[PDB]
Design a protein around this nucleic acid. Structure first.
Lengths: 63, 144, 117, 200
RNA sequence: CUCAGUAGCGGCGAGCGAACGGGGAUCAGCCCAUUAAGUUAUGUGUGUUUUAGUGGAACGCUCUGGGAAGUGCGAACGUAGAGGGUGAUAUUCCCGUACACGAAAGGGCACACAUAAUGAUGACGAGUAGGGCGAGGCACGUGAAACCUUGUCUGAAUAUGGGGGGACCAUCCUCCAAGGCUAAAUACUCCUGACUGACCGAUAGUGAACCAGUACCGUGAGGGAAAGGCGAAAAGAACCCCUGUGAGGGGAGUGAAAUAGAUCCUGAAACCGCAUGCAUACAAGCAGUGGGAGCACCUUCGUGGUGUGACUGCGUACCUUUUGUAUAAUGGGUCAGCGACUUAUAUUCAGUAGCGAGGUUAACCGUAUAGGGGAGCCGUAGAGAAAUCGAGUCUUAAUAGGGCG
RNA sequence: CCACAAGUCGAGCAGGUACGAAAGUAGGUCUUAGUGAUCCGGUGGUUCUGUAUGGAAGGGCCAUCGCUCAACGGAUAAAAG
């Protein structure tokens, strides 16, 4: 049978030229107590760590 | 020479497959490379990919983001150097589909500056970047 | 392609049993017991190829000691005297001469004690 | 190249079809693919599920002093199922079009430079007679041979049917194993031209 | 076959999973009361096929041998050198094979006519479409949930009309429900004929090669075995002797062979006897190993070979599981036979071969491993959630800075 | 600093401010505890998308709200002998 994508991982990751990009955690709620620096530095996308790239490749084989 | 018993494959083309559990001298006897006991030594022993022993996984402790656009599935991208496969001088969506650089179900295309062209082309109804238009005009074509 | 094992298996077992010739009881009749016996024999042979050299050197030293004490020296003093006199005849030949030629051994002892003096 | 028929007539053949260098690995791959594609692959065995009976546990799990068992058709037991039962298989491989054509070109060039290909202007038989065909091959000194012609005349086919080590094929039916197995290949000029157009 | 494991669904978990479009196989439409295409029976005609069969080529000598088809020397047929048998291995010994002929009588199929009958209670579709409540189906779990079915309660308009285009409204596009019939391309094998196998060869292959769903077990449903081989030909041992007119054997005879003599080809191992050579009744233990006298036979007379081994140094089996086992921790009475990393699909990496900024076809067609088939897939460009731009793009008031390229 | 997910310090640049005559100081409090991922929903904004088309519903992005999930990397919305 064809390999099946893990759709949760597909919804959480996207592919770049040499890796995968992802969003950052701790920005959904409980935001008042956090300082402005954390608020603005937890915004945007970062890269998937090389320790997790292999697992991401196993879970999402077509992206 | 040239007989059914005088033909050979190239060196390194074929290898013997590995056979487990066939004695001490083979080096993979007894356990067959699986180690001693535990879940991974059993039949069908590996755990599901993405399982990390119980803690919240990498794809579940991170948030979802984005939405999928439907028009992106029908937008097609064409390299400038692929215009060489076009037969004739007119470059259009139908002609690119006939030349097999665009899938038949796409409804529009864009030309990017990637390679080089030599012939003079006429473009009708295909989007061009600023570099690609300059390249086309330098080669000797016109737009629309 | 179905493969039968009889001929090759019989050949292997027969070779082991042939190497087990002469042993007592089931050790020369029963394949399992015979197979265990052959490996142990190989291990013993490997160890005894080293033990043999020590045993024969001990025998030579004992015979040289007897000859030296017949000629009025001890083994250690005779060896030291020969080393000082620069004779490089080894213990195997020395023991052979001690066994089979008393006069020559007496001459060697005279040389050794002359060098010791 | 120029080639010379048995009568000394000169024929022109391009380097593409009859002049390539010999690539032994390519030829071996194509020949092995043909031999594997010739297989039938019809067989089967019975696993522990397919063998008759065996549904009930032979005896209770504990207390009897025997080794525990679940069925009398276990692959450990005599009469039980086979551990990994076979099924019918397909043994055909894929061969690239260009790789196949290149292998045929190499085979033809090797035959030419080994002097096993004999070019003849015309090869026809008057009547379906094995003796007549045998004499015609003997005069050419091609007793063991594969005969390639532009078209397969019924008289020639009937004459060749009973001859050992002699077979006749059309120009568009040559195969690499046949080109190699026979001692010589006797080819007509028209067939050579068609194989030239096909480039092996 | 692709699109595509994409769009989506989902304690947004595990998992489930389309369609549009494109490429093929096959192609076909006809009617609602005077009523069609089509289908089914019956008879006739024509064609084919089938149920027995007939003819069917060509070899001698010599050597070995129980026996020739085998050695050596020469010859013949071939639209027949497929296969089987004959005392060992046959195109020319037999049955056959290629090929050419053949049917009183019966059967199948095809096409065409005649008669039936069906299609065909049905004439443009009302308790219907739609709606409220509860469920089910759709890739779609109540969700923004369209569309289909209906258990319960209701309920239109009827061509200036009505359904759909994924909540809903308007505009456009498209179709006409509440009446019917219809071949091919598709699915399967209790069975029949022919042919085939890098399928098995008596613990294998069907449970069953043999008087097998039998013996046997069970109240019953049900469960379920073991067991093939004399010899080319019985020529299967007349007759004599021991013995109980027994069993069994010894002669004679047959046979190439009887240690091929009846549960009879070959006849391994565990296990059990008889015979010869050496050692062994004052000596303590995984039974061997390194030395080593004597004896017996052979002998090229030896610094040789075979068998045995007085005396002596060292030396607590194997497997598994463990920090660690002689362990008094596990497993094995012994032998022989069987017994465990496979197969299909998808994907990634490494070798190797072809082509190379290109590479490659899938289904399918094809008297078919060829040749056609370019739909599709991978590579050739990124950035961004996206619209959008594009060797750049995103963020920003910023051309600053910074992130991915 | 660190397996990951996270955490900590920061000169300097642009805009708008406050206090000083000025050079200047200020991106919370001497510092190290006062905390909770993802999913699902709510509220404000938006030059994003919008299943024929124009809207809309729904979704996205930015900001923010609802945990003694305290067995505090949190198996279910929901569980004793």
């Amino acid at each position: 049978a064809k390999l099946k994508t893990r759709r949760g991982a597909a919804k959480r990751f996207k592919a770049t030229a040499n890796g995968f990009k992802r969003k950052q955690a701790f920005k959904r709620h409980i935001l008042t107590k956090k300082s402005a620096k954390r608020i603005r530095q937890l915004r945007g996308c970062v890269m998937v760590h090389v320790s997790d790239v292999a697992s991401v490749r196993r879970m999402c084989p077509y992206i | 020479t040239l007989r059914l018993n005088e033909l050979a494959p190239a060196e390194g083309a074929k290898r013997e497959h590995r056979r487990l559990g066939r004695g001490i001298g083979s080096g993979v006897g007894k356990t067959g490379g699986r180690g001693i006991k535990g879940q991974k030594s059993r039949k069908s022993g590996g755990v599901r990919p993405g399982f990390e022993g119980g803690q919240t996984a990498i794809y579940r402790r991170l948030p979802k983001f984005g939405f999928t656009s439907q028009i992106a599935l029908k937008t097609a991208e064409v390299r400038l150097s692929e215009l060489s496969k076009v037969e004739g001088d007119i470059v259009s969506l139908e002609t690119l589909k006939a030349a097999n650089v665009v899938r038949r179900d796409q409804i529009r295309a864009r030309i990017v500056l990637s390679g080089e062209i030599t012939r003079a082309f006429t473009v009708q109804g295909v989007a061009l970047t600023k570099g690609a238009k300059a390249a086309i005009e330098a080669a000797g074509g016109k737009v629309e | 392609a179905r493969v039968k094992r009889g001929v090759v298996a019989h050949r292997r077992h027969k070779k082991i049993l042939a190497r087990a010739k002469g042993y007592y009881g089931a050790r020369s009749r029963v394949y399992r017991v015979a197979f265990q016996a052959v490996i142990k024999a190989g291990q013993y042979a490997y160890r005894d190829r080293r033990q043999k050299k020590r045993q024969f050197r001990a025998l030579w030293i004992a015979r040289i000691n007897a000859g030296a004490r017949q000629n009025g020296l001890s083994y250690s003093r005779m060896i030291d005297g020969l080393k000082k006199a620069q004779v490089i005849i080894d213990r195997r030949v020395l023991a052979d001469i001690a066994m089979h030629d008393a006069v020559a051994f007496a001459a060697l002892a005279e040389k050794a004690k002359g060098a010791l003096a | 190249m120029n080639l010379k028929t048995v009568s000394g007539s000169a024929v022109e053949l391009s380097e593409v079809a009859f002049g390539r260098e010999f690539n032994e690995a390519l030829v071996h791959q194509v020949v092995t693919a043909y031999l594997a594609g010739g297989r039938q692959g019809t067989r089967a065995h019975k696993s522990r599920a397919d063998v008759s009976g065996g549904g009930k546990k032979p005896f209770r799990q504990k207390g009897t002093g025997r080794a525990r068992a679940g069925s009398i058709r276990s692959p450990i037991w005599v009469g039980g199922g086979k551990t990994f039962a076979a099924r019918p298989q397909d043994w055909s491989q894929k061969v690239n079009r260009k790789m196949y054509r290149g292998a045929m070109q190499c085979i033809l060039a090797e035959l030419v430079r080994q002097d096993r290909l004999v070019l003849v202007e015309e090869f026809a038989v008057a009547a379906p007679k094995t003796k007549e065909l045998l004499a015609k091959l003997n005069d050419l000194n091609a007793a063991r041979a594969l005969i390639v012609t532009d078209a397969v005349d019924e008289n020639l086919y009937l004459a060749a049917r009973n001859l050992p080590h002699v077979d006749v094929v059309d120009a568009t039916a040559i195969d690499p194993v046949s080109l190699i197995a026979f001692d010589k290949v006797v080819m007509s000029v028209a067939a050579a031209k068609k194989i030239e157009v096909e480039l092996g």
